[PDB]
Amino acid sequence: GPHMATGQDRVVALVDMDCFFVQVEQRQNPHLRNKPCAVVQYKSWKGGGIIAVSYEARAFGVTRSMWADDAKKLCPDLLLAQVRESRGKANLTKYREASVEVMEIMSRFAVIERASIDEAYVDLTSAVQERLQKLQGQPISADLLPSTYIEGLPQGQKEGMRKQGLFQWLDSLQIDNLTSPDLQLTVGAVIVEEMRAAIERETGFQCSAGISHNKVLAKLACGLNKPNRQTLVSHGSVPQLFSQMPIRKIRSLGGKLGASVIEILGIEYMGELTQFTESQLQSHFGEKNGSWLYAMCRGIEHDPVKPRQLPKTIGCSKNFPGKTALATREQVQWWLLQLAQELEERLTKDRNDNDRVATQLVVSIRVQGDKRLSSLRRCCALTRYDAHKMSHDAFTVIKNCNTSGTEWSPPLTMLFLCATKFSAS
DNA sequence: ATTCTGACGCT
Ligand SMILES: Nc1nc2c(ncn2[C@H]2C[C@H](O)[C@@H](COP(=O)(O)NP(=O)(O)OP(=O)(O)O)O2)c(=O)[nH]1
Ligand SMILES: [Mg+2]
Ligand SMILES: [Mg+2]
């Protein structure tokens, strides 16, 4: 009753760019705009692996993790843009720099947690208060929410339903109560519209947004109405929302843990978790997960918006599947050098931009036939931004995996250098 | 033979 907290204290938004790499390519090459198009890596093996698909191409069934040669079978007019290759590997620089454009705009409005290359979380709690005070009891007009969906509304053409649902919501709002959580989400949603307009005016990129009370619901909400739309998931929309929402759709339940929840408990949808006591959930899934499941299926999550705009690591990786696996000493050195040279270029730029230095170098490898994704992971000290030292140090730290009696055995199916443990500079 | 990352938990 009066003492059960409900997790309505914060306003949090999740903003995610629509088909991000495709839009980066469509801004640069106007011929790709408004066409079925995808972004690939490499081109020789089945036309390249697709990692970004425009919404026009998706109408034909083109998805991520698909080979371009297969996508062409579904979509014969599909236009492909290729990630830049450097030193024999894919080079994601253009998208990381495009991401920085976006993150810097978002950060003018509020503190953001960079959650991926194309998405950040936003804590709007303070911005909403400041804004609620400025409005001075003034009602909120649908004109301020031109692209907002209210989840679960209307109740009782797509743009027609959106406006109906928005009118119903706005009509019910108690505008004189500066502490009502629904009012705060609505105001949060006004700011997100502003944030999304500034991103498009200043980058040309379009995006979607989720507006709710915590990071997990904002993320879920963000996908309900992509593309170029934002969605407000209110505390009261949760029971209906979760009653048919598959467990796997919730961030962090998409894998094994969500599968064990499904299998142990004999359930399918998020809302079914509410029938289990916290202790029961803790008993099956641990004290942390259990507490987090007991609260999450009621729409409650306390994970904070971390004030972190920059990555914590900087990493370079290349897979070597199949017969291309590295089998010689010279080969493993040349690719450590290729990896280290990109890492160095990235690091020197990070130091100059962000006033910091990485202090630890992590080397990860895979050998052929090793079931695991990493056959080994070892760290050494990262004392100089010198590619030749880093690659040499990576070799020193993995050379005892070779079993050869100049040859390399087992052949390596993955090299991976990561710079970590940043310190101010 | 999607590949290339990046966060964060567990022990
Ligand atoms: N190298 C690599 N890049 C990837 C991979 N997956 C995605 N990317 C790249 C390409 C993606 O643009 C971006 C991740 O953004 P998302 O939210 O996952 N997808 P998007 O923005 O395309 O579509 P929408 O958000 O509208 O659903 O990173 C991958 O496995 N590998
Ligand atoms: Mg995206
Ligand atoms: Mg994303």
Short mmCIF file of C-alpha atoms (C1' of nucleotides) and ligand atoms in Angstrom, two decimals:
data_model
loop_
_atom_site.label_atom_id
_atom_site.label_comp_id
_atom_site.label_asym_id
_atom_site.label_seq_id
_atom_site.Cartn_x
_atom_site.Cartn_y
_atom_site.Cartn_z
CA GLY A 1 0.00 0.00 0.00
CA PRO A 2 1.45 3.34 1.15
CA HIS A 3 4.94 1.88 1.79
CA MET A 4 5.56 -0.25 -1.30
CA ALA A 5 7.78 1.81 -3.59
CA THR A 6 6.69 1.75 -7.21
CA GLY A 7 9.78 2.91 -9.11
CA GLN A 8 8.29 6.13 -10.46
CA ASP A 9 10.92 8.47 -8.96
CA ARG A 10 13.06 8.77 -12.13
CA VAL A 11 12.44 9.68 -15.75
CA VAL A 12 14.78 7.79 -18.08
CA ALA A 13 14.93 7.75 -21.87
CA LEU A 14 16.71 5.36 -24.23
CA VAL A 15 17.59 6.81 -27.63
CA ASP A 16 18.72 4.46 -30.41
CA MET A 17 19.60 5.40 -33.97
CA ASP A 18 17.52 3.80 -36.75
CA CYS A 19 19.60 1.43 -38.94
CA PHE A 20 22.57 3.47 -37.80
CA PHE A 21 25.41 2.45 -40.13
CA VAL A 22 23.00 2.60 -43.13
CA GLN A 23 22.06 6.18 -42.25
CA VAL A 24 25.77 7.08 -41.92
CA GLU A 25 26.28 5.74 -45.45
CA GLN A 26 23.04 7.39 -46.73
CA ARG A 27 24.17 10.80 -45.45
CA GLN A 28 27.50 10.43 -47.26
CA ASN A 29 26.06 8.95 -50.50
CA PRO A 30 22.62 10.45 -51.27
CA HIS A 31 21.96 7.74 -53.90
CA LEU A 32 21.34 5.30 -51.04
CA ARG A 33 18.70 7.45 -49.36
CA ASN A 34 15.20 5.95 -49.25
CA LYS A 35 16.38 2.77 -50.97
CA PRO A 36 16.58 -0.82 -49.74
CA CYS A 37 20.16 -0.87 -48.53
CA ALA A 38 22.39 -2.69 -46.07
CA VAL A 39 25.90 -2.26 -44.67
CA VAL A 40 28.31 -5.21 -44.95
CA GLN A 41 31.80 -6.19 -43.81
CA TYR A 42 34.07 -7.80 -46.46
CA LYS A 43 32.70 -8.82 -49.90
CA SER A 44 34.51 -11.96 -51.13
CA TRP A 45 32.77 -14.50 -48.81
CA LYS A 46 29.09 -14.62 -49.97
CA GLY A 47 29.15 -10.86 -50.69
CA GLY A 48 29.86 -9.95 -47.04
CA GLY A 49 28.10 -10.26 -43.72
CA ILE A 50 25.28 -7.77 -43.16
CA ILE A 51 25.30 -5.74 -39.94
CA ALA A 52 22.81 -2.96 -40.77
CA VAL A 53 19.64 -2.98 -42.88
CA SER A 54 17.44 -0.08 -43.86
CA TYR A 55 13.73 -0.41 -43.15
CA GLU A 56 12.98 -0.59 -46.87
CA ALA A 57 15.30 -3.60 -47.21
CA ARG A 58 13.72 -5.19 -44.11
CA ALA A 59 10.35 -5.22 -45.85
CA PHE A 60 11.93 -7.88 -48.09
CA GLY A 61 13.21 -9.96 -45.17
CA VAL A 62 16.80 -8.67 -45.13
CA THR A 63 18.21 -8.99 -41.60
CA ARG A 64 21.50 -8.67 -39.72
CA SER A 65 23.86 -11.70 -39.71
CA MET A 66 22.74 -12.49 -43.25
CA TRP A 67 25.14 -12.92 -46.19
CA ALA A 68 24.75 -10.30 -48.88
CA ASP A 69 24.48 -12.99 -51.56
CA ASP A 70 21.45 -14.40 -49.71
CA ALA A 71 19.89 -10.98 -49.12
CA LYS A 72 20.13 -10.35 -52.86
CA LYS A 73 17.92 -13.40 -53.35
CA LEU A 74 15.25 -11.81 -51.17
CA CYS A 75 15.88 -8.25 -52.42
CA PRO A 76 17.46 -8.03 -55.90
CA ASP A 77 17.62 -4.22 -56.00
CA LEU A 78 19.40 -4.16 -52.59
CA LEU A 79 22.11 -1.53 -52.41
CA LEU A 80 25.19 -2.48 -50.37
CA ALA A 81 27.69 -0.22 -48.66
CA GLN A 82 30.93 -1.70 -47.43
CA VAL A 83 32.68 -0.92 -44.17
CA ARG A 84 36.13 0.57 -44.70
CA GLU A 85 38.99 -1.94 -44.65
CA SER A 86 42.39 -1.00 -43.30
CA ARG A 87 45.44 -3.17 -42.67
CA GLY A 88 43.43 -6.16 -43.86
CA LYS A 89 40.57 -5.68 -41.40
CA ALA A 90 37.25 -3.93 -41.04
CA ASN A 91 37.60 -0.35 -39.74
CA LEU A 92 34.64 1.12 -37.87
CA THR A 93 36.10 4.62 -37.47
CA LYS A 94 33.40 6.46 -39.46
CA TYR A 95 30.59 5.14 -37.26
CA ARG A 96 32.43 5.77 -33.97
CA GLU A 97 32.98 9.37 -35.12
CA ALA A 98 29.37 9.56 -36.27
CA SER A 99 28.31 8.25 -32.87
CA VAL A 100 30.32 11.03 -31.17
CA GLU A 101 28.37 13.62 -33.16
CA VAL A 102 25.17 12.17 -31.70
CA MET A 103 26.34 11.61 -28.11
CA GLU A 104 27.63 15.18 -27.91
CA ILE A 105 24.22 16.60 -28.92
CA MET A 106 22.36 14.38 -26.44
CA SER A 107 24.74 15.43 -23.67
CA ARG A 108 23.68 19.08 -24.05
CA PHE A 109 20.29 18.10 -22.59
CA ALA A 110 21.24 15.75 -19.75
CA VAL A 111 23.85 13.31 -18.53
CA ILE A 112 23.91 10.24 -20.77
CA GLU A 113 25.24 6.68 -20.36
CA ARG A 114 26.72 5.49 -23.65
CA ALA A 115 25.18 2.03 -23.97
CA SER A 116 26.40 1.13 -27.48
CA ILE A 117 27.78 2.81 -30.60
CA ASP A 118 24.28 4.02 -31.51
CA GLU A 119 22.41 4.32 -28.22
CA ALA A 120 22.60 6.14 -24.89
CA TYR A 121 20.44 6.32 -21.80
CA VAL A 122 19.33 9.69 -20.48
CA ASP A 123 18.37 10.71 -16.93
CA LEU A 124 15.71 13.35 -17.51
CA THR A 125 14.51 13.57 -13.89
CA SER A 126 16.12 17.00 -13.31
CA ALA A 127 15.34 18.34 -16.76
CA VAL A 128 11.64 17.51 -16.27
CA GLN A 129 11.53 19.32 -12.93
CA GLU A 130 13.21 22.41 -14.38
CA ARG A 131 10.73 22.24 -17.27
CA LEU A 132 7.65 21.59 -15.10
CA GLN A 133 8.59 24.75 -13.20
CA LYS A 134 8.91 26.78 -16.40
CA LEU A 135 5.53 25.71 -17.76
CA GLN A 136 3.87 27.06 -14.60
CA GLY A 137 0.78 24.85 -14.63
CA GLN A 138 0.42 25.22 -18.40
CA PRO A 139 -1.25 22.23 -20.11
CA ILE A 140 0.66 20.03 -22.52
CA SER A 141 -0.45 20.20 -26.17
CA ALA A 142 -0.35 17.25 -28.59
CA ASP A 143 1.59 19.60 -30.85
CA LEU A 144 4.59 19.14 -28.57
CA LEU A 145 4.47 15.35 -29.04
CA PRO A 146 4.31 14.90 -32.84
CA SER A 147 5.96 11.45 -32.86
CA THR A 148 5.08 10.01 -29.43
CA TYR A 149 3.10 6.79 -28.94
CA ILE A 150 1.45 6.18 -25.57
CA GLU A 151 1.81 2.46 -24.95
CA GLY A 152 -1.51 0.70 -24.32
CA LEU A 153 -3.57 3.56 -25.85
CA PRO A 154 -6.05 4.11 -27.37
CA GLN A 155 -8.40 1.86 -25.41
CA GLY A 156 -12.18 1.77 -24.95
CA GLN A 157 -4.34 4.39 -40.20
CA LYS A 158 -1.32 4.17 -37.83
CA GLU A 159 -1.03 7.97 -37.40
CA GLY A 160 -4.74 8.03 -36.51
CA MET A 161 -4.31 5.52 -33.73
CA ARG A 162 -1.21 7.33 -32.47
CA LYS A 163 -3.07 10.64 -32.22
CA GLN A 164 -6.13 8.98 -30.64
CA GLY A 165 -3.89 7.37 -28.03
CA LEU A 166 -2.06 10.65 -27.45
CA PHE A 167 -5.33 12.61 -27.09
CA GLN A 168 -6.74 10.13 -24.55
CA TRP A 169 -3.53 10.36 -22.50
CA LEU A 170 -3.24 14.17 -22.66
CA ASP A 171 -6.93 14.60 -21.71
CA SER A 172 -6.44 12.54 -18.55
CA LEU A 173 -3.31 14.38 -17.38
CA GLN A 174 -3.38 16.16 -14.00
CA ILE A 175 -1.24 19.16 -15.00
CA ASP A 176 -1.46 20.96 -11.62
CA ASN A 177 0.31 18.13 -9.70
CA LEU A 178 4.06 18.59 -10.27
CA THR A 179 4.76 15.25 -8.52
CA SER A 180 2.55 12.89 -10.64
CA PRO A 181 4.79 10.31 -12.37
CA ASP A 182 2.65 10.27 -15.49
CA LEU A 183 3.03 14.02 -15.87
CA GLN A 184 6.79 13.69 -15.49
CA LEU A 185 7.02 11.04 -18.23
CA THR A 186 4.91 13.25 -20.49
CA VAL A 187 7.27 16.15 -19.89
CA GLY A 188 10.25 13.83 -20.33
CA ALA A 189 8.66 12.91 -23.64
CA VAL A 190 8.43 16.56 -24.68
CA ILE A 191 12.17 16.93 -24.07
CA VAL A 192 12.96 13.77 -26.02
CA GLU A 193 11.09 15.14 -29.06
CA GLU A 194 13.30 18.23 -28.75
CA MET A 195 16.36 16.02 -28.35
CA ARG A 196 15.41 13.96 -31.38
CA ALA A 197 14.77 17.04 -33.51
CA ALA A 198 18.18 18.50 -32.63
CA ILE A 199 19.86 15.21 -33.53
CA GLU A 200 18.23 15.25 -36.97
CA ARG A 201 18.74 18.97 -37.65
CA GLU A 202 22.43 18.78 -36.62
CA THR A 203 23.39 15.34 -37.97
CA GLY A 204 20.70 14.41 -40.48
CA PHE A 205 20.25 11.11 -38.59
CA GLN A 206 16.87 9.86 -37.41
CA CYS A 207 16.35 7.81 -34.25
CA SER A 208 13.80 6.26 -31.89
CA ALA A 209 13.36 6.71 -28.12
CA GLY A 210 11.79 4.97 -25.16
CA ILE A 211 10.54 7.09 -22.26
CA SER A 212 9.80 5.35 -18.96
CA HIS A 213 10.98 5.28 -15.33
CA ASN A 214 14.01 3.02 -15.69
CA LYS A 215 16.58 1.85 -18.20
CA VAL A 216 15.00 -1.52 -18.98
CA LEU A 217 11.54 -0.18 -19.80
CA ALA A 218 12.96 2.70 -21.83
CA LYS A 219 14.92 0.17 -23.89
CA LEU A 220 11.91 -2.12 -24.37
CA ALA A 221 9.75 0.93 -25.15
CA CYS A 222 12.24 2.20 -27.73
CA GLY A 223 11.57 -0.72 -30.03
CA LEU A 224 7.79 -0.72 -29.97
CA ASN A 225 7.41 1.87 -32.74
CA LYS A 226 10.64 2.11 -34.73
CA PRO A 227 11.35 3.79 -36.95
CA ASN A 228 11.48 7.60 -36.32
CA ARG A 229 9.05 7.38 -33.35
CA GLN A 230 9.26 7.52 -29.55
CA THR A 231 7.22 5.53 -27.07
CA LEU A 232 6.09 6.39 -23.52
CA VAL A 233 5.67 3.28 -21.34
CA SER A 234 3.93 4.35 -18.17
CA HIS A 235 3.94 2.53 -14.87
CA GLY A 236 0.27 1.62 -15.50
CA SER A 237 0.89 0.24 -19.00
CA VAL A 238 3.20 -2.45 -17.55
CA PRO A 239 0.67 -5.16 -16.48
CA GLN A 240 -0.99 -5.34 -19.89
CA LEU A 241 2.34 -4.76 -21.65
CA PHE A 242 4.03 -7.60 -19.78
CA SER A 243 1.06 -10.01 -19.85
CA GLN A 244 1.95 -11.09 -23.43
CA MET A 245 5.55 -9.89 -23.58
CA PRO A 246 7.89 -12.88 -24.04
CA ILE A 247 10.53 -13.07 -21.34
CA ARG A 248 13.33 -12.99 -23.96
CA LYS A 249 12.33 -9.46 -24.98
CA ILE A 250 13.64 -7.93 -21.74
CA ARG A 251 17.23 -6.69 -21.77
CA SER A 252 19.50 -9.36 -20.18
CA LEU A 253 16.90 -12.16 -20.42
CA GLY A 254 17.51 -12.77 -24.12
CA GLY A 255 20.00 -15.58 -23.40
CA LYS A 256 20.49 -18.58 -21.10
CA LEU A 257 19.17 -16.93 -17.93
CA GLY A 258 15.89 -16.06 -19.61
CA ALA A 259 15.78 -19.61 -20.96
CA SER A 260 16.16 -21.08 -17.49
CA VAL A 261 13.44 -18.75 -16.18
CA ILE A 262 11.21 -20.08 -18.93
CA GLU A 263 12.19 -23.70 -18.28
CA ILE A 264 12.37 -23.85 -14.47
CA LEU A 265 9.23 -21.80 -13.79
CA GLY A 266 7.20 -23.16 -16.73
CA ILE A 267 6.18 -19.69 -17.95
CA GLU A 268 6.37 -17.67 -21.19
CA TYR A 269 5.68 -13.96 -20.50
CA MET A 270 7.18 -11.32 -18.19
CA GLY A 271 3.96 -10.71 -16.25
CA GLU A 272 3.85 -14.34 -15.12
CA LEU A 273 6.86 -13.68 -12.88
CA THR A 274 4.60 -11.68 -10.48
CA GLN A 275 3.19 -14.92 -9.06
CA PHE A 276 6.56 -15.91 -7.50
CA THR A 277 7.88 -14.65 -4.21
CA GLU A 278 11.18 -12.85 -4.20
CA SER A 279 12.65 -15.71 -2.17
CA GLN A 280 11.50 -18.27 -4.74
CA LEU A 281 13.08 -16.27 -7.57
CA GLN A 282 16.28 -15.83 -5.54
CA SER A 283 16.23 -19.57 -4.86
CA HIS A 284 16.38 -20.47 -8.59
CA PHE A 285 18.42 -17.63 -10.09
CA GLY A 286 20.52 -16.19 -7.25
CA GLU A 287 19.98 -13.39 -4.77
CA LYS A 288 20.80 -10.62 -7.28
CA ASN A 289 18.82 -11.97 -10.23
CA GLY A 290 15.92 -12.95 -7.99
CA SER A 291 15.56 -9.48 -6.45
CA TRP A 292 15.96 -8.05 -9.93
CA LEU A 293 13.30 -10.37 -11.35
CA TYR A 294 10.81 -9.82 -8.54
CA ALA A 295 10.98 -6.05 -9.12
CA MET A 296 11.36 -6.04 -12.93
CA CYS A 297 8.17 -7.95 -13.70
CA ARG A 298 6.34 -5.21 -11.79
CA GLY A 299 8.02 -2.53 -13.93
CA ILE A 300 10.60 -1.60 -11.27
CA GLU A 301 14.37 -1.35 -11.80
CA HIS A 302 16.87 0.76 -9.92
CA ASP A 303 19.95 0.47 -12.15
CA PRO A 304 21.20 4.07 -12.44
CA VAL A 305 22.02 6.07 -15.55
CA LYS A 306 25.80 6.04 -15.25
CA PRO A 307 27.38 9.34 -16.27
CA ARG A 308 29.66 7.81 -18.91
CA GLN A 309 29.85 9.10 -22.47
CA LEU A 310 33.10 7.48 -23.55
CA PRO A 311 33.94 3.77 -23.91
CA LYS A 312 35.77 2.08 -21.03
CA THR A 313 37.81 -0.05 -23.44
CA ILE A 314 39.21 0.28 -26.96
CA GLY A 315 39.55 -2.97 -28.86
CA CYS A 316 40.66 -4.47 -32.16
CA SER A 317 39.64 -7.91 -33.33
CA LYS A 318 39.76 -10.17 -36.36
CA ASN A 319 38.27 -13.65 -36.76
CA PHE A 320 40.13 -16.17 -38.95
CA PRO A 321 37.61 -18.95 -39.65
CA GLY A 322 38.18 -22.17 -41.46
CA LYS A 323 41.21 -22.66 -43.69
CA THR A 324 42.15 -19.00 -43.18
CA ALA A 325 43.16 -19.67 -39.56
CA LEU A 326 46.70 -18.54 -38.78
CA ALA A 327 49.18 -21.40 -38.81
CA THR A 328 52.64 -19.82 -38.92
CA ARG A 329 54.71 -17.60 -36.63
CA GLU A 330 55.12 -14.91 -39.30
CA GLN A 331 51.33 -14.83 -39.78
CA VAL A 332 50.54 -14.43 -36.12
CA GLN A 333 53.07 -11.62 -35.79
CA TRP A 334 51.92 -9.75 -38.90
CA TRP A 335 48.29 -9.71 -37.69
CA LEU A 336 49.27 -8.74 -34.15
CA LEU A 337 51.08 -5.86 -35.82
CA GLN A 338 48.04 -5.03 -37.93
CA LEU A 339 45.82 -5.13 -34.87
CA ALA A 340 48.26 -3.09 -32.78
CA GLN A 341 48.66 -0.39 -35.45
CA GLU A 342 44.94 0.28 -35.51
CA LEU A 343 44.81 0.17 -31.72
CA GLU A 344 47.64 2.71 -31.54
CA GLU A 345 45.94 5.06 -33.98
CA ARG A 346 42.73 4.84 -31.96
CA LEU A 347 44.57 5.29 -28.63
CA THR A 348 46.58 8.33 -29.67
CA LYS A 349 43.36 10.00 -30.77
CA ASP A 350 41.61 9.03 -27.53
CA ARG A 351 44.45 10.50 -25.45
CA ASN A 352 44.33 13.82 -27.34
CA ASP A 353 40.53 14.04 -27.25
CA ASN A 354 39.62 12.68 -23.84
CA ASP A 355 42.69 13.37 -21.63
CA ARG A 356 43.36 9.80 -20.58
CA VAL A 357 45.69 6.86 -21.11
CA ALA A 358 45.09 3.13 -21.09
CA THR A 359 47.35 1.22 -18.72
CA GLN A 360 46.56 -2.46 -19.46
CA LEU A 361 46.66 -4.48 -22.69
CA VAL A 362 44.45 -7.57 -22.96
CA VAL A 363 45.29 -10.27 -25.53
CA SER A 364 42.60 -12.82 -26.49
CA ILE A 365 42.93 -15.62 -28.98
CA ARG A 366 41.06 -18.61 -30.33
CA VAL A 367 42.61 -21.79 -31.67
CA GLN A 368 40.99 -23.90 -34.36
CA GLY A 369 38.61 -26.47 -32.98
CA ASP A 370 38.45 -24.84 -29.58
CA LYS A 371 34.76 -24.88 -28.70
CA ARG A 372 35.17 -21.66 -26.66
CA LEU A 373 35.17 -18.14 -28.13
CA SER A 374 38.42 -17.42 -26.23
CA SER A 375 41.06 -20.10 -25.95
CA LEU A 376 42.97 -17.73 -23.62
CA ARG A 377 42.97 -14.20 -22.31
CA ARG A 378 46.09 -12.69 -20.77
CA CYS A 379 46.99 -9.14 -19.78
CA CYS A 380 50.26 -7.21 -19.77
CA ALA A 381 51.21 -3.63 -18.93
CA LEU A 382 50.43 -0.99 -21.56
CA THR A 383 53.19 1.55 -21.00
CA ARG A 384 53.65 3.14 -24.48
CA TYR A 385 51.33 3.83 -27.44
CA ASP A 386 53.74 1.98 -29.73
CA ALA A 387 52.27 -0.58 -32.09
CA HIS A 388 55.49 -2.60 -32.37
CA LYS A 389 55.81 -2.88 -28.59
CA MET A 390 52.13 -3.78 -28.07
CA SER A 391 52.16 -6.45 -30.78
CA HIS A 392 55.50 -7.81 -29.52
CA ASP A 393 54.14 -7.84 -25.94
CA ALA A 394 50.98 -9.59 -27.12
CA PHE A 395 53.12 -12.29 -28.74
CA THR A 396 55.31 -12.79 -25.67
CA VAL A 397 52.10 -13.28 -23.69
CA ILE A 398 50.63 -15.91 -26.06
CA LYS A 399 53.69 -17.62 -27.63
CA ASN A 400 53.48 -20.61 -25.23
CA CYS A 401 50.23 -21.71 -26.88
CA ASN A 402 52.12 -22.83 -29.96
CA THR A 403 52.79 -26.58 -29.75
CA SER A 404 54.78 -26.84 -33.03
CA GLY A 405 58.22 -28.41 -32.92
CA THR A 406 58.20 -21.43 -37.24
CA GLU A 407 54.80 -23.17 -37.47
CA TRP A 408 51.79 -22.40 -35.25
CA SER A 409 49.67 -25.18 -33.77
CA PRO A 410 46.73 -25.21 -33.12
CA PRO A 411 45.95 -22.64 -35.79
CA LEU A 412 44.48 -19.41 -34.43
CA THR A 413 40.89 -18.57 -35.33
CA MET A 414 40.79 -15.20 -33.56
CA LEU A 415 43.13 -12.38 -32.51
CA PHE A 416 41.96 -9.66 -30.13
CA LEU A 417 43.77 -6.71 -28.50
CA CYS A 418 41.95 -4.52 -25.97
CA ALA A 419 43.27 -1.46 -24.16
CA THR A 420 41.80 -1.08 -20.67
CA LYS A 421 42.31 0.54 -17.25
CA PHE A 422 42.27 4.17 -18.33
CA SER A 423 43.83 6.83 -16.12
CA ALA A 424 43.60 10.60 -16.41
CA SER A 425 46.31 12.29 -18.47
"C1'" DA B 1 32.44 -18.86 -42.61
"C1'" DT B 2 28.28 -13.16 -40.18
"C1'" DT B 3 32.21 -10.32 -37.87
"C1'" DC B 4 33.53 -6.77 -34.73
"C1'" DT B 5 33.09 -5.09 -30.83
"C1'" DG B 6 31.85 -3.32 -25.83
"C1'" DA B 7 29.70 -3.75 -20.68
"C1'" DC B 8 29.64 -6.21 -16.82
"C1'" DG B 9 29.25 -10.57 -13.49
"C1'" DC B 10 31.44 -14.54 -11.32
"C1'" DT B 11 35.16 -16.72 -8.86
N1 LIG C 1 30.68 -5.04 -36.46
C1 LIG C 1 29.41 -5.20 -36.11
N2 LIG C 1 28.61 -4.15 -36.16
C2 LIG C 1 27.37 -4.40 -35.79
C3 LIG C 1 26.89 -5.58 -35.38
N3 LIG C 1 25.55 -5.48 -35.05
C4 LIG C 1 25.26 -4.23 -35.28
N4 LIG C 1 26.33 -3.52 -35.74
C5 LIG C 1 26.41 -2.11 -36.15
C6 LIG C 1 25.41 -1.69 -37.22
C7 LIG C 1 24.22 -1.15 -36.44
O1 LIG C 1 23.71 0.00 -37.10
C8 LIG C 1 24.81 -0.76 -35.08
C9 LIG C 1 24.04 -1.27 -33.89
O2 LIG C 1 22.77 -0.60 -33.83
P1 LIG C 1 21.44 -1.40 -33.65
O3 LIG C 1 20.48 -0.77 -32.77
O4 LIG C 1 21.78 -2.81 -33.15
N5 LIG C 1 20.85 -1.59 -35.14
P2 LIG C 1 20.44 -0.45 -36.21
O5 LIG C 1 20.85 0.88 -35.78
O6 LIG C 1 21.13 -0.86 -37.51
O7 LIG C 1 18.91 -0.61 -36.43
P3 LIG C 1 17.72 -0.33 -35.42
O8 LIG C 1 18.39 0.27 -34.21
O9 LIG C 1 16.90 0.72 -36.08
O10 LIG C 1 17.00 -1.53 -35.14
O11 LIG C 1 26.14 -1.31 -35.02
C10 LIG C 1 27.79 -6.65 -35.36
O12 LIG C 1 27.44 -7.78 -35.03
N6 LIG C 1 29.06 -6.46 -35.73
MG MG C 2 20.00 1.43 -33.78
MG MG C 3 21.56 -0.03 -30.73
#
